[PDB]
């Protein structure tokens, strides 16, 4: 090459896109308790996991901002403050849990009229870095023949969740619409692996079906031009 | 009371804005960096990877899966036509969608670089003959005759040398030239020899590949 | 009028944001710092504190309160089994919840360090015999026989030396090894001697204990 | 908590405010600058361009389109009056609206500079005579007689010299002087010669043209 | 467009906040300081003053 100033790596990775969507129904049947918990599950969606699966060894912090509005784009003066529970502590199950009274958990409160919120959280996972693949048995216990009582629900791998409540004596009477954007701050990778070509059947397993697919069949016949 | 001016565009959300925030806990120390003898810093490592390209996309049966990776050649055909490579364009459909670079171009528009092809001969120990692979330069149409093929750049392929032959296309961008492969001569063997053989091809790119413009296009799904 | 850009996230409340404000009264002087000869700056002082660990958590009667702190040993039992220490994990339940470090780990996830045990002998002045305390290394299962115990690291405990014996476990993290205590030999005494004795144990950690990740977990209540 | 004063005029939109924003993608590299031997930096290049000015704006027929670019002259007229240039003002209507500078002045108010005129003679090879072009200085009214014309600056125009004659008006602003063109003498030819000829004129400006005040005026439509 | 973070506690009124503002008229000159031979700077002068104390608060 001759000049590599315009070819800067800055544009090679930085792309903001919609990743999550959280709804707050005022009544419902799926969530009739009026509160929901959303763990950070990158593997939940296929379209984002395709970019991430090219990477094997990574550790980084996160930055999120929250916006709420109406389907017509009108703005309303509502204030929220967000509280985070470390992943080590178990997540609340019922409203009468002690997680809402914990004062030892740090919190940061910002308004909406101010410039957009910029918050960062450190890497608190006890491991060194996240591992997307594991050629073995995920449990790190001395027992290698039985299974844990909490099989299926293993929050020991994720990074926790957030709790949302409304300020006021009575419950809020407006549902909100919120969209979330995700990004990486540092990019460092070691072992390059191929991505996926066919579609996914299950959310947590890459298994396939008996109807095989082909990358392309554009050429009617190879014998002719 | 310090005077300050309010610039327009305060509540706008910017997708490309890189921001940094102070950590909530300044006391926890992240895990130390792991030292490894071999170190790799740049994405250039992928540019030298070899990928196989195939043309016979006709069959779709389950029990014909393994034969896809090659294309057969037989002595029954005489001075016909071996393979017809489509227009070389990673963005468009064809053999290039399986390659790594073509997928990388799915968010991008303009590309340029050099192309190289390598061929090795896997015939019988007693056979004699001559093969020739040539790329037609731009401007020239598809070769109707071998005379129109010879005016372009051609490389002699002897059977004593296996793979040291290198052909380079100086520059490809996005209109362009075409490449065609004919039977230089029929492969003939005496009695007690197999009547069918197979040919393996290689394709790679040089260091002069660059990117200019990003695109907000996703090919999935 | 000075232009300025409004970054996103203005009204957000941050828990980990360290802030400073100007004092309302700049004239009042705080009390002077008190000078003391001995000075301590770091929390490391707690890491060298000894804590007793007990196994006989069976009794719950009021009038059996004082006997909890030890465990008795008698000559009636012959080559049986003295004590079965559970898996060494401060986070999990067991003898470790009473210790200071285990409580400190209640807001934390990953720990690593070394372990040491000290034993002193408090028998009669005329008695003779040999005691042996060994820790099974990781991989090896619970000791079915003393032969499987001897392959691991063992230390000789003479009755002429009281407490200078030191055993060190190189590294423990979070799966791991196990420790068991058998009767090396039966304690026998002649007539005119007590038939029962008591044994005192010690447990501490080395300087190589560190913490990595904080957790938002509270064990109270 | 850092104190800050809020200056008045926060939500006002300013048309002349020059602002810069951070790029969304810091990694894409723009195309390199193209190096060319000849380089031009300033708009001054247009100031030395010659433009033709015409007076006979009377005809409007389709089949009279080509004759517009000149004005004919004939020997039948005797000591009459050739052309009457209107007041020299690019802002006002007249021959100056076609010129580049007059269009440039359409967003502007005050102008000043020097004016030059060039004339070349295209008569027969045997003809003899004398032409004179003079510009009346300011103050003096329109010339009723040639005596009032001679007191102003005049230049002798011989037929042996074609175009090296240069006339300069020292200063024009925005009231001013006037320019008129009479028949210095009648063009006479013997038998066997054409009875009609044509004259070509030139007009340009010097380096001393400047602009002071911008105007929010658009002449389209 | 310059990025800036909004710290909590914007509309709070602080009693102990010492603030300074630009004068409206920068041209008027205040009266010059008057020079006196004896100068006193500190409040310590009151600490050496004698005060009478009385006990018979009955009448």
Short mmCIF file of C-alpha atoms in Angstrom, two decimals, chain A residues 54-58 187-193, chain B residues 34-41 45:
data_model
loop_
_atom_site.label_atom_id
_atom_site.label_comp_id
_atom_site.label_asym_id
_atom_site.label_seq_id
_atom_site.Cartn_x
_atom_site.Cartn_y
_atom_site.Cartn_z
CA UNK A 54 -15.67 -15.21 14.86
CA UNK A 55 -14.05 -14.35 18.22
CA UNK A 56 -12.86 -16.77 20.90
CA UNK A 57 -10.94 -14.93 23.65
CA UNK A 58 -12.33 -11.57 24.76
CA UNK A 187 -11.23 -5.52 20.04
CA UNK A 188 -8.69 -8.30 20.62
CA UNK A 189 -8.92 -11.84 19.25
CA UNK A 190 -6.52 -14.79 19.24
CA UNK A 191 -7.80 -18.02 17.64
CA UNK A 192 -9.72 -17.53 14.36
CA UNK A 193 -12.57 -19.96 13.65
CA UNK B 34 -1.47 -13.37 29.49
CA UNK B 35 1.93 -13.45 27.81
CA UNK B 36 2.30 -15.81 24.84
CA UNK B 37 5.44 -16.13 22.63
CA UNK B 38 3.56 -15.83 19.35
CA UNK B 39 1.61 -12.61 18.88
CA UNK B 40 -0.80 -11.56 16.13
CA UNK B 41 -2.19 -8.02 15.86
CA UNK B 45 -3.78 -13.16 8.51
#
